[PDB]
Structures are given as structure tokens and as C-alpha cells.
Design a protein around this ligand. Sequence first.
Ligand SMILES: C=CC1=C(C)C(=O)N/C1=C\C1=NC(=C\c2[nH]c(/C=C3\NC(=O)C(C)=C3C=C)c(C)c2CCC(=O)O)/C(CCC(=O)O)=C1C
Length: 243
Amino acid sequence: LSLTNSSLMPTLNPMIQQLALAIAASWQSLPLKPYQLPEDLGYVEGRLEGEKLVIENRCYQTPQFRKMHLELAKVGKGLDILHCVMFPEPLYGLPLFGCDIVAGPGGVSAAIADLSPTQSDRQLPAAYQKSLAELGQPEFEQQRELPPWGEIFSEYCLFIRPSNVTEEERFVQRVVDFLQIHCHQSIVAEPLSEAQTLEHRQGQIHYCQQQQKNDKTRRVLEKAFGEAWAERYMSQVLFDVIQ
Ligand SMILES: C=CC1=C(C)C(=O)N/C1=C\C1=NC(=C\c2[nH]c(/C=C3\NC(=O)C(C)=C3C=C)c(C)c2CCC(=O)O)/C(CCC(=O)O)=C1C
């Protein structure tokens, strides 16, 4: 998590760098253990007929978080991506933290962040609702509408094109705030029942199945590695469906 040894970090959009730093700082002092991705993946690069895709991966776990995945990527020289998901252990019923940032030479094109529900009523837990509301309604000039598969995201989901540095900073701070709420709730939550655990597991399964419908991610992977590789990557590395 010291991103000191990342080859991509120095080269990424500044908002991405600040978000990577913030995620790493959130995780750094937790009771981390490694999480081995398929084929013990770390760095990977590929090219077919166009630009090369370069990816760096970090992945951990804790008793409360099944899988804590930070991925940085770059397509060619211009397109930078940050992907992060904290997948909860269903036993504790925590929501899913996620963020996705896409940037090119013109700046950040997409900034998405959420604490996504796993309950069958599609609501966040009561404590999360309360803490999130207390942050106030952020102002962003260039909101983007989620695609249909994005029904999985909460009412607090951010999906914007930042308009200026002030908005970039506001977005990062809201992610810092989401992480602070999430980490705190993770120590105050225990534990639910076998029926509740099963409910939460289903919510996480559904989240991953829906995330796999993102053709924007899929096309980037396919253009560098092909259809079969992209399908394996999306279903096994990014959005693994638990059992
Ligand atoms: C918590 C949410 C969340 C998580 C965790 C997550 O992984 N994605 C999430 C959301 C989300 N992503 C989106 C977009 C894009 N994502 C990529 C690429 C990659 N994203 C990666 O994570 C990897 C690994 C990529 C490639 C290697 C590109 C290129 C775009 C288009 C950017 C643009 O339009 O300006 C959209 C909008 C979808 C739409 O408009 O139809 C949503 C909603």
C-alpha cells in the first residue's frame, strides 16, 4: 500500500493519485492479510491491434472485508483509470465501497463513488443512512446519469464529470468521508444470523453480476487482451461472484 513502488502512480492523473493515496491511507493500519487474485496476479500488460493496457493490482482482506482491491491502469499514454472495491464479508452485513475514476488528457471524464447496499430492501443500514445524510448534499455542476445496471448503487452514489479543481477536491473529500464512515461502521457492526448472512451474500452476488454489464470496462479490456481474457478478468478478477 505504500504506492512508493508503483510504476504507474507517478504517471497518473492527479485526482487519481490523491484517491489512491487516500484509499491506501484508509487501509494501511487495518488488520490486513494478503488476498491472492487468480494466478496470484499483480502487474499485467497487453496489446492487440491498438494501444497497450497496463494494470497494477493490490489486494487485501480483513475479518470484515472479504476482498479489498485497488487497481490502477493506463491505456496508452492518455487514459488513466482507478478501480477500487471493498467487498464485505457477508457475516457482518456491511455495504460495498466502490470507486471508479477515468481520466484522459482533457481531465477526469468520470468519477464514481458509492457505498452500495446488500440488503434485500436495497437500503443501506440505518447507521450508514444517518452518517451519510450528515455530510450534506454535495454540489456538482456536471452530473451523469447511471446506466440501467447501476440500479445497484445507493442514493448517495456520486457519478460526475468534475468541472474544476474545487470539484475534484470535493469529490476526493467525499470519498475520504465515505471511507471513514465505512471503517468506523465496520468495527461497530458483529454479527448477523445465518438468514441475514445469506441475504447479504445475495446482495453482493447481484452487485457483481450487474457490474459485469459495464461495457465501457469490457471494451477497454477487450481491445488490449480480447474477449476471452476480458470475460475471465471481469468475472474472476474484478467482480467475482461468491458462493
Ligand atoms: C463503484 C462503481 C464502479 C466500479 C467499482 C467499477 O469498476 N466501475 C464503476 C462504475 C462505472 N464505471 C463507468 C465508466 C467507465 N469505466 C471505464 C474503465 C474501467 N473501469 C474499471 O474499473 C476498469 C478496470 C476499467 C478498464 C480497464 C471506462 C473507460 C469508463 C467510461 C468513462 C466515461 O464514460 O467517461 C461507469 C459509467 C458507465 C457508462 O457510462 O455506461 C460507471 C457507472
